[PDB]
Design a protein around this nucleic acid. Structure first.
Lengths: 144, 57, 99
RNA sequence: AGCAGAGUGGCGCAGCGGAAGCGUGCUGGGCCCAUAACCCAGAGGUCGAUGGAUCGAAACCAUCCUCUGCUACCA
RNA sequence: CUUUAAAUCCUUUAACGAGGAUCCAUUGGAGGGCAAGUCUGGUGCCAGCAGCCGCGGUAAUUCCAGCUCCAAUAGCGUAUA
């Protein structure tokens, strides 16, 4: 089970709804280091991250999550955390205030294979509220 | 209908018709005697085409 | 004319990409991509276009191959979407015959 | 926190004093048994905005707005 | 009774031992090759048949069942050398 977690952990994108704090901004691009509250779901390291309000633009993948200078891997609902975001190589890096602003609600860019892995193998680790977030993002991401 | 991949549907939805209580057919030597009589004894001189043994016109 | 519905093993699907050799893949309304097949009554009589609502049969021993039964036109697809047999978030994209 | 490039028909673009255009796309008709090619017509323009230099602005200037590329400056 | 090391098996022989002689003969096939229904119901290119040609599209001489018929017969069908 631990080995299968170790191969298939790169595909499984955890659901999340996570909300920008105004003026808690510490970096703008490469990396993006920025203090954000987690409104719903849970954040895991390596998550592909995106902005729905600007035609599903991608900002990159996260690298390190810090809760008051402590490297904490899992950021759960109700916790105000600092997230370090690295842009995806090969694409244009994104700036703050031009491609996305503080009023945007940033969500995790889930995929259909991630949904399949969460439904088939990660049935234990997801809540009913997390499954509702999965369905809500699936209607947002227009995935049938 | 149901589905296109329903297995054994025509065997399962056909009507069941029971068997009929028929006389015991004699088997062995006297069956050949009946065959010989019906073929080469009761023959009638006909014309044109001879109908088959199962010609149910 | 009539409005045929689903059954205990028959569902609905929408065509994603048109495929050669008399087959296609269609997006079922359960989150599973299924490779459908064109019915032998549909091989030349009527055509199937991209992003159309169709009735699909299933196998009870596997879910990798499927088979298309019939095709819905625009007005009856809108009427069945209004009834509720189809999800509201499913984009029918106004499939129709042009002129 | 700030700089550079661009803003003209749905899309890309020429473009400067005596001048709303080009390729593609859309609609109607013809040609053909039908489609493409071809032929005949039409629709779609605040030339990003304001103000000035001017007899004469889409153009010369100043400012603002929007998009795309850049200084690396944080848990 | 006989056989045989002793039995069993066969032969002989008492007594019982059949009428719808229920003491009940199966295996394949019926379009052609290849002997034998353009019979009756059900499905409608679905289910299936088919060594090869081919048969099924809501009147199937080929599918699934009933009756009749055909080939060999205590035997018949299938796969491989």
């Amino acid at each position: 089970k631990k080995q299968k977690q170790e191969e298939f952990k790169h595909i499984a994108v955890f659901p999340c709804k996570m909300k920008i704090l105004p003026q808690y901004i510490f970096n703008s691009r490469d990396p993006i280091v920025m203090g954000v509250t987690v409104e719903a779901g849970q954040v895991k390291q390596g998550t592909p991250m995106c902005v729905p309000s600007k035609n599903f633009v991608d900002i990159g993948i996260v690298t390190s999550i810090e809760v008051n200078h402590k490297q904490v891997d899992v950021a759960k609902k109700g916790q105000e955390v600092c997230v370090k975001i690295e842009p995806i190589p090969g694409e244009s890096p994104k700036m703050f205030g031009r491609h996305f602003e503080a009023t945007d609600i940033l969500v995790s860019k889930i995929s259909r294979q991630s949904i399949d892995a969460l439904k088939d193998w990660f049935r234990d680790e997801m809540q009913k509220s997390d499954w509702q977030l999965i369905v809500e993002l699936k209607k947002v991401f227009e995935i049938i | 209908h149901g589905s296109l991949a329903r297995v054994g549907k025509v065997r399962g939805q056909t009507l069941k018709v029971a068997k009929q209580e028929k006389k015991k057919k004699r088997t062995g030597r006297a069956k050949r005697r009946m065959q010989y009589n019906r073929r080469f004894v009761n023959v009638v001189p006909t014309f044109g085409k001879k109908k088959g043994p199962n010609a149910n016109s | 004319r009539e409005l045929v519905f689903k059954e205990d093993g028959q569902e609905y699907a929408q065509v994603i990409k048109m495929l050669g050799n008399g087959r296609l893949e269609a997006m079922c309304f359960d989150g599973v991509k299924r490779l459908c097949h064109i019915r032998g009554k549909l091989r030349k009589k009527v055509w199937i276009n991209t992003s159309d609502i169709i009735l699909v049969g299933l196998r009870d021993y596997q879910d990798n191959k499927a088979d298309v039964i019939l095709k819905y036109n625009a007005d009856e697809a809108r009427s069945l979407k209004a009834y509720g047999e189809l999800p509201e978030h499913a984009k029918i994209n106004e499939t129709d015959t042009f002129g």
